[PDB]
């Protein structure tokens, strides 16, 4: 059915757009995988510092942590909807990444 | 700053009461000026 | 037989029909009260009883007796008189004869899934309507449009002597619903014999009532949305009688709404009323605004909400004044309706303020980054 079709080529041009921010993402794993949060509820955080930068050289292994606070927290929902939502999340993340060609994009636009 | 801001937008409002163009999009900033002055929490923003 | 007992309390409604056939025939004046507005007096009279809701029978009981005793007098004319009015006296008659107690001594105070979803619904909506959503703000919504926006002059007491007053002090809420109620059956009475009786052109914008229908015709519809208020909230009254805060918050998107529904202006009402004084503002423009905007500007550069909360007395008293002083402005208009809002909102902050305070992470990182 054309809708099928639709769909698996959503699934391909993640794919496609996730290959050209790789670099950049795993970029963001060695750094904002404990960095960038936004999950924490209730209150104030107890442990400041614990909670976020020692939390869980390119690829780097698991020097710091594994996966103690759920590394796949953020991957829960991400990877619920692995369809519509995550292409425009894998748009983001190349914009993200080639924000230098963007500006250019739109400076001769 | 933010507060600094907010009156800003109040005085743009109330300068236009006294005119002798229109307060909708100021009243519309005034609504997310006041949003964000509010969100500005101990708790959810300092996270 | 659910209606045989349904058709035993209904005679009140039967009755009302009815009265407005007595209405606008017969006589303009004595018919209209005696019969519509003396039965709507008879309602007030057991809301203000605020304990006999439906269970005054006593004048009620009456009621019928001084209606029989008129048809007894009195009612192409002879005849027409006798069969209208019997018509009604049918039916009153029947009350005192058998089923009196259904509506005024037995209602007291002393299928499948689609069909369940909506038995649930009708009770959630009215307790919302036994709730102040609809209490007070609904009424007083549609008394200023019939006031202010409508018969000027002599309506103030119905608003600006009421309703101004009563806003930012609740404790006299419901007595002024029910003074209301009788000051608009008063209003009625009195338009009723017009104004063109040997008019000779004492002062208080006389207006005049010369229309017959139109005139009456709004009068008498904020008399019945006070019935209405009433009935809804005696309804749940006997309903009690007889028949989540911020852990629902985190919890997911359902909690997120739930927790709102229930607590906006909990919280938010202060930026709220911020927001409804631009609104008088840019529906105004004149010299009467820069008052409300001046206020604006003392009540934001406040700060602090609990330096905002010792200028809100004062401030409510400055916009019930000033609906007081619009009137007698316009009379000694939309614009009303405009500070009527924002008193409605701030009234409701100051109940709030020294009272009751005294997947969804991804919408809660719109909102909070």
């Not at chain 1, 970029?27 to 909670?51: C, F, I, N, W």
């Not at chain 2, 307060?23 to 101990?42: A, E, G, H, K, Y």
């Not at chain 3, 000027?152 to 809420?173: D, E, G, I, K, T």
Request: net charge positive; proline share 2%; hydrophobic share 55%.
């Amino acid at each position: 059915f054309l809708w099928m079709l639709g769909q698996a080529l959503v699934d391909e041009l993640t794919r496609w757009l996730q290959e050209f921010t790789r670099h950049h993402g795993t970029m963001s794993d060695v750094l904002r995988a404990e960095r960038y949060l936004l999950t924490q509820e209730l209150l104030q955080g107890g442990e400041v510092h614990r909670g976020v930068l020692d939390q869980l050289a390119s690829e780097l292994l698991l020097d710091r942590r594994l996966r103690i606070p759920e590394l796949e927290e953020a991957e829960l929902f991400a990877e619920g909807q692995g369809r519509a939502l995550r292409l425009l999340r894998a748009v983001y993340q190349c914009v993200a990444a080639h924000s230098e060609l963007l500006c250019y994009f739109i400076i001769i636009l | 700053l933010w507060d600094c801001l907010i009156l800003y937008n109040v005085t743009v409002i109330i300068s236009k009461n006294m005119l002798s163009a229109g307060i909708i999009w100021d009243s519309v900033c005034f609504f997310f000026l006041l949003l964000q002055r509010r969100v500005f929490l101990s708790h959810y923003y300092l996270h | 037989e659910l209606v045989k007992g349904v058709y035993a309390k209904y005679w009140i409604y039967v009755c009302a029909g009815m009265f407005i056939v007595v209405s606008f025939a017969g006589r303009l004046v004595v018919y209209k009260i005696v019969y519509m507005f003396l039965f709507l007096l008879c309602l007030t009279l057991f809301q203000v009883y605020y304990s006999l809701w439906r269970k005054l029978l006593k004048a009620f009981w009456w009621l019928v007796v001084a209606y029989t005793m008129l048809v007894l007098i009195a009612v192409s004319e002879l005849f027409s008189s006798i069969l209208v009015p019997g018509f009604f006296l049918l039916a009153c008659i029947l009350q005192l004869h058998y089923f009196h107690r259904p509506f005024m001594q037995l209602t007291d105070m002393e299928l499948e899934l689609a069909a369940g979803f909506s038995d649930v619904l009708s009770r959630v909506q009215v307790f919302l309507r036994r709730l102040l959503e609809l209490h007070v703000f609904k009424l007083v919504a549609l008394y200023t449009v019939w006031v202010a926006l409508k018969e000027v002059s002599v309506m103030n007491l119905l608003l600006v002597v009421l309703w101004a007053f009563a806003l930012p002090y609740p404790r006299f809420r419901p007595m002024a619903s029910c003074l209301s109620t009788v000051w608009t059956c008063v209003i009625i009475v009195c338009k009723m014999l017009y104004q063109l009786k040997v008019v000779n052109p004492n002062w208080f914008g006389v207006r005049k009532g010369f229309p017959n229908l139109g005139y009456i015709q709004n009068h008498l519809q904020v008399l019945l949305l006070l019935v209405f208020e009433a009935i809804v909230y005696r309804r749940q009254e006997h309903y009690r009688r007889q028949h989540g805060t911020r852990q629902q918050l985190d919890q997911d998107l359902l909690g997120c709404l739930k927790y709102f529904i229930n607590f906006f202006f909990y919280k938010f009402g202060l930026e709220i009323c911020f927001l409804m004084a631009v609104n008088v503002i840019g529906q105004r423009m004149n010299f009467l605004v820069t008052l409300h905007g001046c206020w604006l500007v003392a009540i934001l550069t406040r700060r602090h909400r609990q330096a905002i909360a010792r200028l809100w007395p004062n401030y409510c008293l400055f916009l019930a004044l000033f609906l007081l002083y619009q009137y007698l402005l316009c009379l000694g208009s939309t614009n009303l309706i405009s500070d009527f809002l924002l008193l409605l909102c701030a009234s409701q902050q100051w109940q709030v303020f020294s009272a009751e305070r005294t997947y969804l992470d991804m919408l809660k990182v719109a909102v909070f980054r």
